[PDB]
Amino acid sequence: ADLSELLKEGTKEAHDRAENTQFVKDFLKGNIKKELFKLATTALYFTYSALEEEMERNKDHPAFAPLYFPMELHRKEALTKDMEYFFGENWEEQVQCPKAAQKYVERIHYIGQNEPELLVAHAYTRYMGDLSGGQVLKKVAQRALKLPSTGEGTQFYLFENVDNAQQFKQLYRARMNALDLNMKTKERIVEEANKAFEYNMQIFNELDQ
Ligand SMILES: CCCCCCCCCCCCCC(=O)O
Numbered sequence: 001a002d003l004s005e006l007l008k009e010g011t012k013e014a015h016d017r018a019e020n021t022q023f024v025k026d027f028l029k030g031n032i033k034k035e036l037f038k039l040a041t042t043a044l045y046f047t048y049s050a051l052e053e054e055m056e057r058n059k060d061h062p063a064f065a066p067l068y069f070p071m072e073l074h075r076k077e078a079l080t081k082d083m084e085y086f087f088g089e090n091w092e093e094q095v096q097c098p099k100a101a102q103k104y105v106e107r108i109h110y111i112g113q114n115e116p117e118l119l120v121a122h123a124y125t126r127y128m129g130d131l132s133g134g135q136v137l138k139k140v141a142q143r144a145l146k147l148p149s150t151g152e153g154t155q156f157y158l159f160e161n162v163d164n165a166q167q168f169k170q171l172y173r174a175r176m177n178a179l180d181l182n183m184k185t186k187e188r189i190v191e192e193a194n195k196a197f198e199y200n201m202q203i204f205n206e207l208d209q
Contacts, residue, residue: 022205039207125193
């Protein structure tokens with residue numbers, strides 16, 4: 001069956017578990033204060049820094065190259081702007097990676113250096129969710145934190161180079177389903193995606209504290 005279909009069915013439960021964490025339910029209610037949002041944003045910066053370093057490393061690898069979208073998808077530059085807004089120009093000295101995020105970052109580096117055919121599990125799960133959810137999450141955070149109308153602090157959530165998210169999600173899915181993969185590796189990709197949702201849940205719960 002289609003890898004996209006296997007990922008939908010094989011990750012529904014782990015997806016729902018992460019969506020039902022206390023941090024997510026508080027955020028969507030607007031109950032997320034600035035300092036804690038700065039920590040959550042720090043976690044994203046280190047996560048997407050790692051993910052995009054590994055996608056660039058495998059940009060020519062046949063099990064990943066069709067999904068290399070630096071212009072359309074990469075978030076590191078956007079997150080850098082958000083970190084500069086929330087912390088100021090010397091933001092890099094002010095942060096440290098949260099422990100569960102550091103564990104996810106290590107797993108991304110391992111996957112990209114040792115099992116590049118699984119890197120899609122992380123890219124799909126992160127960027128397809130980002131594209132669907134960006135506008136909703138941006139509005140919630142701008143209102144709750146009273147952020148500037150001009151978009152400072154929420155550039156992570158805006159895909160400046162994706163004209164239409166539903167058309168791009170469709171293109172991305174069709175390319176993923178066309179990767180030449182047997183059922184052995186497709187099942188590992190589903191298990192790696194569930195692994196990602198687990199790291200996701202662990203980062204949320206570390207934020208909740
Ligand atoms: C989903 C709505 C809340 C967004 C708040 C930002 C905090 C993100 C924590 C998750 C980090 C990525 C983990 C993963 O790879 O799944």
